[PDB]
Design an enzyme around this catalytic site. Structure first.
Site, PDB file in Angstrom:
ATOM      1  N   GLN A 226       7.698  12.026  -6.298  1.00  0.00           N
ATOM      2  CA  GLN A 226       7.725  11.557  -4.920  1.00  0.00           C
ATOM      3  C   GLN A 226       7.923  12.731  -3.973  1.00  0.00           C
TER       4      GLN A 226
ATOM      5  N   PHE B 202       4.504   8.671  -3.637  1.00  0.00           N
ATOM      6  CA  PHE B 202       5.059   8.819  -4.977  1.00  0.00           C
ATOM      7  C   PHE B 202       3.963   8.555  -5.996  1.00  0.00           C
TER       8      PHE B 202
ATOM      9  N   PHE C 282       8.526   9.826 -15.051  1.00  0.00           N
ATOM     10  CA  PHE C 282       8.855   8.642 -14.268  1.00  0.00           C
ATOM     11  C   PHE C 282       8.133   8.628 -12.923  1.00  0.00           C
TER      12      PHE C 282
ATOM     13  N   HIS D  58       6.619  -1.323  -3.616  1.00  0.00           N
ATOM     14  CA  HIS D  58       5.761  -0.376  -2.923  1.00  0.00           C
ATOM     15  C   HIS D  58       4.308  -0.656  -3.279  1.00  0.00           C
TER      16      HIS D  58
ATOM     17  N   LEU E  51       8.570  -0.971  -9.976  1.00  0.00           N
ATOM     18  CA  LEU E  51       7.977  -0.529  -8.722  1.00  0.00           C
ATOM     19  C   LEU E  51       6.871  -1.453  -8.229  1.00  0.00           C
TER      20      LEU E  51
ATOM     21  N   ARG F 220      11.189  14.983  -4.926  1.00  0.00           N
ATOM     22  CA  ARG F 220      11.767  14.277  -6.061  1.00  0.00           C
ATOM     23  C   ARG F 220      10.804  14.349  -7.234  1.00  0.00           C
TER      24      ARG F 220
ATOM     25  N   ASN G  11       8.977   4.465  -0.276  1.00  0.00           N
ATOM     26  CA  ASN G  11       9.791   3.942   0.809  1.00  0.00           C
ATOM     27  C   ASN G  11      11.156   3.550   0.262  1.00  0.00           C
TER      28      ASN G  11
END
Lengths: 61, 224, 66, 223, 143, 169, 33, 49, 124, 49
Positions: free
Chosen positions: F67, F117, F64, F130, F126, F59, F106
């Site tokens: 990941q 990430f 941004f 995480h 976030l 990803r 996760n």
């Protein structure tokens, strides 16, 4: 030509590698490799592989 | 301290070195730096290696194989002869000149022989003192031979075994000990019929106690 | 026996040592007894020695045999 | 003992009455003072401690030797004490001033037997180099050297009455009865099955008890 | 008398071995290879093999821990125990670790050795049968 | 000191350099231990050093997040750690309000696995969801080049951006 | 302590001494295997 | 060979494991015993004597 | 130092000669490794001296040998590192006790005797 | 014990002594007489003692 030169250069490089002393202490090897500027472990290599890598690095330098 | 290694480790180290050398030669042949090895041919091996060609001209083949054998033999001999000249060299200066490490302690053995009238035994004792580089002195008197030998421990152990077993009237070590420095010069003999002259010669180097112990041993032998 | 009954300057160490020597003393005297019994019973049964090697077992056997 | 503890026991009790501690090294020698109050203990801690009967404390922990002090030898009057170390050095300290007077240098091995003469002028120190140096306290020099045996001399002591004869004992399974002056040997006490570790003479001088390494004690008397 | 040696083996066995040996000092002076032979009666073979007799077996071989092993692992076990027993004597004869610390320090390693000997065999992969060969493979000649 | 790791980024077969990311063992000892086990590895599956070596970023959302690190499935759904499965979060004291911080990626609470990430910017949403496994002390240009990689459907990069080598520095 | 390796000739402590020997003569063809 | 045979007769009491197989005669299973050759020679000589 | 109980401990100079002699005896098969073999040799009355190591956590496992030596009139000496003693003995495994055995007409005799004397010179 | 030490000393200093060796057997305990003493003793000499 360049092929014979390079293969001979690698030949004496290996010969130098066989005749270089490296300590058997894992901690001292780790400290020496850190001093040389290379990561201690290469993708989860074994201690013998770490010692061989340190020996080759010393041979090149 | 130096550390030994077991026979297993010796065998493994020798095997590893030999395998390393063989791999080195083989990879040298791989890269063209070395010509491929020629078969080792002897008289028995002749008809097996050069059988198809020995019938062409046998005497030339015999000459070639003998030349190869002689080349191997002479290659073996040169190094050996050079290092045997090395033997002469050291033996006369590095393989026989040790001195037994006599720097911090001098072993001094003073013996008192009863009958030493033979010059051959004195000449043999002087040759043993000069060959082993052991200092000392010898004093002669009426049924008295006080032989003091100061040197290394191995030289003293050789001199005691030479005087007690290799030389024959009885010889016994009166005082076997250690000293800080050397007191007697080169191996020489001094004849003193009077005890006062021998005592003054022993006290000139500070070893009058050995002459006094020899006189006390002679008095104890004459009393009992 | 007195040392055992006491716990039921003469320390216990000497009693322990003399007991652990008494075991060898009684073993040797029992060996003597077994030799004498063997010598006597050889007349009655000159084979039970080889058949029964243990000394105490020999004594119990001759006791139960006679 | 070799644990460093000193055991002062009585003549009737089998247990030690006093347990003088304070030393971790192996206590080599322990000798009471001639006055009877003090006691010098020489151990392998390169020092020498002084205890007392009415104090039971460290009076003087006189160090100075490069190695451990093996044997100590006090004077007959009690004014001086000669402590010999394991580095072939012997310091004669003063019991009234607290300073060394004589340096007994000249030996090769470690000094094991040292005892002052009862006359007050001589001092005999026996080392392990098969020799024995008899020095003079008034002349301040080594008067003579006595190669009595060929082994390490561990016992050297003269007569307690006058000191006319000196008993030199080494590890050669024999003892030598020399003399006060020239020290000419008179008697060779042989027969010991082991090395003569310790020896002593009587207060009258008629019997000499010399123990050996064969776990036996042998007395030598006049016949 | 012998705390560590009583810890290592059964108390009855310890008493029997010291009795036959002659004493704690007498047993401590014996070699390890000899202690395991203590009280080894010369059982006569009644036509059976010598192995049925179980010779060269001593009181240590009949101890509690040794008898708790499979027969093929018995003799070896005895030897081990004997050796450690010797050590205990060589400690107990000098009155050290009277609580038995050496006793535990030896019994735990005895248990470890027994576990290692009795451990389940590891997983061993089977070699697949090699494929049939074709072509030519150079094989040397000579003597 | 904190353990420092190193990972050579290989995008499209071209090495963009090594990324030195030091794991914060004080605030996250479990995440640092998982990163140390996944960097080199001794024996994970039948005596095989399985870890983050050879994984790729599945990803990539530009400025941004980046990941990836999924060595089980490769698409980000793989969850594996040194605790024999997913583990819980260490602490919520570390925030993702700084670029370059690599957190345990996760899908919810107590589901932190091998997916990591790297935050390309300050993500306030976030924080708390995480825990930050570590911070990139060096090699920010390779992370900026991997975050600016062209991504297709569902932020999947069209060019293979995998880790050629990984270990402890 | 400090001991000299009989196969390397370097001053090495005795605590690792035996281990220094075991991985001292390790044959590289073992690594190959 | 005779000296070894005599030594084994006089001293040897423990022996190596002997294998067992069964010949099938479809009516009964006859035992066949596999003994080591070293002991086999001694046993053969003993039987002959 | 580490073992204060080892009263007959050899110095650095003596240890080198001791280990050299042990290695030479191993070459001549005149050496017995291990405490049990040393005890067996002492009982057989074939040994001449015992070389023991001062590093052993249940140290008393060797303490039986000196007393037996005093029973059999045999010199004994202590060494610092058991690993060095084992290396001198020809065994990679650490060895805490070794013995030297008598052979008829042995070439080592004199050297043996020399070391023997040193031990008697080391005792007190 | 001192007797054994002296005996051991006598054997060490005076080998090949038949009477001394035979009497040393009698010093040794029964479990240690035949097993070790007599074999080395027979090796040393074959005296009528």
């Amino acid at each position: 030509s360049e092929r014979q030169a390079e293969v001979l250069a690698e030949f004496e490089r290996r010969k130098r590698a066989r005749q270089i002393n490296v300590s058997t202490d894992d901690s001292e090897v780790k400290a020496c490799l850190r001093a040389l500027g290379e990561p201690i472990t290469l993708f989860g290599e074994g201690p013998a592989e770490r010692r061989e890598r340190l020996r080759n690095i010393l041979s090149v330098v | 301290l130096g550390v030994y290694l077991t026979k297993k480790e010796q065998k493994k180290l020798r095997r590893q070195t030999r395998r390393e050398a063989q791999k080195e030669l083989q990879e040298k042949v791989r890269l063209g730096l070395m010509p491929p090895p020629e078969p080792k041919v002897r008289i028995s091996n002749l008809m097996r290696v050069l059988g198809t060609e020995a019938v062409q001209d046998p005497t030339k083949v015999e000459a070639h194989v003998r030349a190869q054998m002689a080349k191997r033999q002479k290659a073996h001999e040169e190094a050996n002869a050079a290092r045997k000249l090395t033997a002469e060299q050291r033996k006369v200066k590095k393989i026989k000149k040790l001195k037994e490490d006599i720097s911090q302690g001098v072993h001094i053995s003073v013996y008192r022989v009863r009958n030493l009238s033979n010059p051959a035994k004195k000449f043999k004792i002087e040759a043993n003192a000069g060959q082993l580089y052991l200092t000392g002195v010898v004093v002669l008197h009426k049924d008295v031979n006080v032989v003091v030998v100061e040197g290394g421990p191995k030289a003293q152990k050789k001199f005691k075994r030479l005087m007690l077993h290799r030389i024959k009237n009885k010889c016994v070590l009166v005082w076997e000990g250690t000293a800080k420095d050397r007191s007697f010069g080169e191996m020489k003999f001094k004849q003193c019929p009077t005890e006062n002259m021998a005592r003054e010669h022993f006290k000139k180097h500070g070893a009058e106690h050995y002459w006094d112990l020899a006189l006390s041993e002679s008095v104890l032998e004459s009393t009992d | 026996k007195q040392a055992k009954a006491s716990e039921v300057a003469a320390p216990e160490y000497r009693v322990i040592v003399d007991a652990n020597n008494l075991t060898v003393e009684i073993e040797n005297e029992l060996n003597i007894i077994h030799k004498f019994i063997r010598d006597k019973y050889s007349k009655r049964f000159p084979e039970l020695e080889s058949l029964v090697p243990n000394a105490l077992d020999y004594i119990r056997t001759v006791k139960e045999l006679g | 003992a070799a644990d460093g503890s000193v055991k002062l026991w009585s003549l009737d009790s089998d247990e030690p009455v006093a347990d003088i501690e304070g030393h971790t090294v192996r206590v080599a020698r322990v000798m009471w003072h001639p006055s009877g109050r003090f006691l010098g203990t020489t151990c392998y801690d390169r020092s020498w401690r002084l205890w007392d009967l009415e104090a039971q404390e460290e009076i003087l922990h006189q160090e100075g030797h490069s190695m451990g002090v093996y044997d100590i030898a006090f004077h007959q009057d009690g004014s001086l004490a000669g402590t010999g170390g394991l580095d072939a050095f012997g310091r004669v300290w003063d019991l009234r001033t607290g300073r060394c007077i004589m340096f007994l240098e000249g030996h090769l091995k470690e000094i094991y037997g040292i005892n002052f003469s009862p006359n007050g002028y001589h001092i005999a120190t026996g080392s392990g180099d098969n020799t024995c140096k008899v020095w003079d306290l008034r002349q301040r020099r080594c008067v003579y050297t006595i190669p009595a045996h060929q082994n390490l001399v561990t016992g050297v002591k003269f007569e307690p009455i006058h000191g006319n004869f000196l008993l030199t004992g080494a590890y050669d399974n024999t003892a030598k009865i020399w003399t006060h002056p020239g020290w000419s040997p008179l008697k060779t006490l042989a027969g010991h099955e082991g090395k003569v570790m310790g020896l002593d003479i009587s207060s009258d001088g008629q019997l000499i008890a010399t123990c050996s390494y064969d776990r036996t004690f042998k007395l030598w008397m006049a016949e | 008398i012998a705390p560590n040696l009583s810890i290592i083996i059964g108390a009855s066995t310890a008493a029997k071995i010291m009795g036959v040996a002659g004493g704690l000092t007498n047993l401590s002076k014996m070699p390890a290879c000899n202690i395991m032979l203590l009280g080894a009666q010369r059982k006569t073979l009644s036509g059976f093999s010598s192995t049925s007799v179980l010779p060269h077996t001593g009181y240590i071989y009949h101890s509690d821990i040794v008898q708790s092993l499979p027969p093929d692992l018995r003799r070896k076990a005895a030897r081990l125990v004997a050796a450690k027993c010797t050590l205990a004597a060589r400690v107990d004869s000098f009155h050290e670790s009277t609580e038995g610390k050496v006793g535990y320090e030896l019994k735990d390693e005895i248990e470890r050795k027994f576990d290692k000997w009795q451990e389940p065999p590891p997983v061993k992969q089977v070699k697949p049968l090699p494929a049939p060969l074709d072509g030519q493979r150079k094989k040397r000649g000579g003597r | 000191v904190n353990p420092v790791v190193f990972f050579d980024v290989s995008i499209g077969g071209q090495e963009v350099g090594r990324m030195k990311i030091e794991l914060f063992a004080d605030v996250v000892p479990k995440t640092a231990e998982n990163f140390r086990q996944f960097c080199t590895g001794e024996f994970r599956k039948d005596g095989v050093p399985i870890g983050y070596k050879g994984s790729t970023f599945h990803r990539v959302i530009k400025d941004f997040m980046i990941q990836g690190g999924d060595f089980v499935n490769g698409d980000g759904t793989g969850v594996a750690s040194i605790y024999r499965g997913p583990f819980a979060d260490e602490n919520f004291k570390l925030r993702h309000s700084a670029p370059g911080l690599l957190s345990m990626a996760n899908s919810g609470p107590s589901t932190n696995g091998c997916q990591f990430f790297i935050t390309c910017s300050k993500c306030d949403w976030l924080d708390g969801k995480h825990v930050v496994f570590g911070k990139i002390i060096d090699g920010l240009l390779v992370m900026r080049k991997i975050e600016n990689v062209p991504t297709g459907p569902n932020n999947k990069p069209k060019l293979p951006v995998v880790i050629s080598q990984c270990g402890e520095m | 302590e400090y001991l000299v390796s009989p196969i390397t000739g370097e001053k090495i402590p005795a605590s690792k001494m035996q281990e220094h020997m075991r991985i001292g003569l390790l044959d590289p063809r073992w690594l190959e295997q | 060979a005779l000296s070894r045979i005599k030594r084994h007769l006089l001293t040897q009491r423990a022996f190596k494991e002997v294998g067992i197989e069964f010949m099938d005669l479809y009516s009964h299973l006859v035992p066949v015993y596999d003994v080591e050759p070293l002991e086999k020679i001694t046993d053969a000589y003993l039987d002959q004597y | 130092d580490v073992n204060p109980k080892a009263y007959p401990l050899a110095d650095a100079h003596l240890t080198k000669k001791l280990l050299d002699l042990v290695q030479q005896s191993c070459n001549y098969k005149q050496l017995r490794k291990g405490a049990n073999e040393a005890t067996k040799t002492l009982n057989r009355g074939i040994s001449e001296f015992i070389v023991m190591a001062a590093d052993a956590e249940p140290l008393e496992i060797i303490l039986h040998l000196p007393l037996l030596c005093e029973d059999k009139n045999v010199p004994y000496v202590f060494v610092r590192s058991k690993q060095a003693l084992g290396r001198a003995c020809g065994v990679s495994r650490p060895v805490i006790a070794c013995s030297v055995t008598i052979k008829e007409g042995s070439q080592l005799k004199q050297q043996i005797q020399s070391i023997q004397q040193s031990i008697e010179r080391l005792l007190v | 014990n001192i007797a054994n030490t002296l005996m051991a000393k006598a054997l060490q200093e005076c080998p090949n002594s038949g009477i001394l060796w035979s009497e040393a057997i009698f010093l040794e305990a029964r479990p240690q007489r035949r097993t070790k003493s007599v074999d080395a003793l027979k090796k040393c000499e074959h005296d009528p003692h």
